[PDB]
Symmetry: C2
Subunit: 235 residues, 2 copies
């Protein structure tokens, strides 16, 4: 199998499901005592966050590109960035490190395309929804029309994420609100909804969503397994 390089620690809590799912996927497909060949670089999130806070995106790009080059020197054969938000600087990593870069939006784009959908909705942090680094990738590379909530909806969605979800508060009022937004975007033509992070899928079970859910973090990990085994698009 190919050795995958993970860029993580953003946060470390969300890096663990990548490591778990990649090993579980390898263990299933190959059997026996097989486990995943993984190289992981976990950053100090404080430094990354301080850069974000100050809008120092070029600096985060340098930091992550250098981590990726380091993993390459250790023998990594592909790069997975274990965070939606930091794909803002995916272009920095791709251009400076020659390893294949497995974009989080690309993995979900292939999943959506595989289901025959052409129009979807994206729920995530406000930054992730408003920026073009995720939704622009889907449209440019997959011809997928990607709807986002309106500004008032995006602000409330964002508040719920950072004031409740990230603290472990999963309330029905918030769950209901999310369900309402999904349903409204369904009426606007969305055929599926992308959950931009784990915490949204924890709040909203699929039976509470009128649309099929794309768990973009879980899809990303599955895509990494496929890359390691040279499957499908990676064949």
């Amino acid at each position: 199998m190919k050795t995958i390089g993970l860029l993580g620690g953003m946060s470390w809590e969300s890096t663990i499901p990548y490591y778990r799912l990649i090993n579980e996927g390898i263990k299933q497909r190959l059997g026996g005592l097989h486990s995943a060949q993984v190289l992981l670089h976990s950053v100090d999130f404080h430094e990354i966050e301080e850069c974000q806070r100050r809008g120092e995106w070029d600096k985060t790009g340098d930091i992550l590109a250098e981590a990726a080059l380091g993993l390459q020197r250790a023998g990594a054969e592909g790069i997975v960035l274990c965070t939606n938000t930091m794909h803002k600087v995916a272009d920095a990593i791709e251009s400076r490190c020659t390893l294949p870069f497995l974009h989080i939006a690309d993995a979900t784009g292939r999943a959506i395309t595989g289901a025959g959908m052409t129009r979807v909705a994206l729920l995530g942090t406000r930054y992730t929804m408003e920026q073009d680094f995720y939704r622009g990738r889907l449209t440019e590379q997959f011809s997928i029309n990607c709807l986002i909530p309106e500004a008032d909806e995006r602000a409330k969605i964002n508040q719920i994420i950072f004031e409740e979800l990230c603290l472990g508060q999963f309330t029905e009022a918030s769950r209901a609100y999310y369900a309402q937004v999904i349903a409204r975007l369904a009426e606007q033509g969305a055929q599926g909804v992308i959950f931009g992070c784990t915490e949204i899928g924890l709040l909203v079970p699929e039976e509470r969503s009128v649309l099929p859910v794309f768990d973009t973090a879980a899809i990303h990990a599955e895509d990494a397994v496929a890359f390691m085994l040279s499957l499908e698009h990676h064949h």
Copy 2:
């Protein structure tokens, strides 16, 4: 902070607590949103198992030594091997990679020294208890005496690990047997008891033991945090 290099995937399930504990320890010490600077090389464990089956024991050492060299090329500043028993080949790693090798037994030696003890006991797999890779490192580097149970006790301890604990079965019959072994070791003058693996700690809560408990896996992670921060 210094970047720690982890050799894991033996198993990947047991690597995760190392990662959790080092991140939590760093956050506790530095506050805010600080997390650990960590490089991890997770092996395909099947390759390790097959080296043993093929009788290529030197290759096991070479695989891990090269993994440590790879982490060193990626920026690691010390090496932690996330498994007790694979320290059987720690000499390959420590002698080929010049980064400080934070031997699992060194971490627990510092803990025991910190507690003012000179005589302890070790519970673990029969292999870990009977061979010199763990106990020898302890005594040679720290002048700490490390006793092990008598022969029938080591057999039962080992059987309980592989037949029960590794399959997620934690029975009071087995728990009581361990606690009685610990009491016997205290009678022979052990001042604390080392738990060689997490499974033993899952079976015996430290308060059930008549001796102070050194959880060697958890201490190993705490020691890495101390190294990363120069304390």
